[PDB]
Write a protein that binds this ligand. Structure first.
Ligand SMILES: O[C@H]1c2c(C(F)(F)F)ncc(OC3CC(F)(F)C3)c2C[C@H]1F
Lengths: 107, 104
């Protein structure tokens, strides 16, 4: 299973689907406001920051990243996050990132 | 109504069934996410847009990304809203739609 989130380009969660409870253990409000990188394994923090940086250059194409995400029940879960920018072409608002987040096997 | 206010996300299986929908869809088109689950998006399309939407889907399924251009979506309490949708296949595991309402 999996949950969608939306982030601003700095990685901050701005929307989280409630499917996240079953996936990583938090309620939407425990994620909303916080930067995703705060839930990520210190060895995977930089790859993840660099991934947010790149998704915004890839012309709305899908960028995938695998990283360890600290669940509420304390454990490192392997996550596959596929993400893409969206920007309403009727406006010139800053784009943001849409993410799908799935628990996958590292194996 | 601000731009963010006319936009909702949907997720679909490869057969177009809803597997997820933003609560925002409620104030725009009437339906409750809960009652959309398992129903195919195709059921909600105006007949005059059906074939175009079948083709938009076919282009999505082979290329991974698509812009629907304009289509009418049946409202829960009658009437059709106009929408435009950007679709993206997540690899295939599901289709993610960013849907924008072109109506009032
Ligand atoms: O075929 C995909 C699709 C597209 C497409 F343009 F990307 F092809 N546009 C609108 C769609 O569903 C509508 C969005 C909605 F309003 F929620 C129902 C869907 C369901 C997907 F399976």
């Amino acid at each position: 299973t999996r949950f969608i989130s939306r982030h601003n380009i700095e990685g901050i969660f701005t929307f989280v689907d409630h499917r996240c409870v079953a996936t990583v253990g938090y309620q939407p409000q425990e994620l909303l406001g916080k930067n995703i990188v705060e839930f990520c394994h210190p060895e995977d923090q930089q790859l993840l920051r660099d991934s947010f940086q790149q998704v915004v250059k890839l012309k709305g194409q899908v960028l995938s990243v695998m990283f360890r995400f600290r669940s509420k029940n304390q454990e490192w879960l392997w996550m596959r996050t596929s993400s893409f920018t969206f920007q309403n072409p009727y406006s010139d608002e800053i784009e943001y990132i849409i993410c799908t987040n799935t628990n996958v096997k590292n194996s | 109504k601000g731009l963010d206010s006319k936009t909702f996300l949907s997720e679909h299986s490869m057969d177009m069934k809803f597997t997820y929908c933003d609560d925002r869809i409620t104030e725009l088109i009437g339906y409750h996410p809960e009652e959309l689950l398992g129903r195919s998006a195709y059921e909600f399309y105006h007949a005059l847009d059906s074939e175009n939407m079948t083709k938009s889907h076919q282009n999505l399924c082979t290329k991974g990304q698509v812009v629907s251009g304009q289509y009418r979506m049946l409202a829960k309490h009658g009437g059709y809203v106009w929408l435009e949708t950007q679709g993206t296949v997540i690899y295939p595991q599901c289709i993610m739609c960013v849907n924008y309402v072109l109506s009032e």
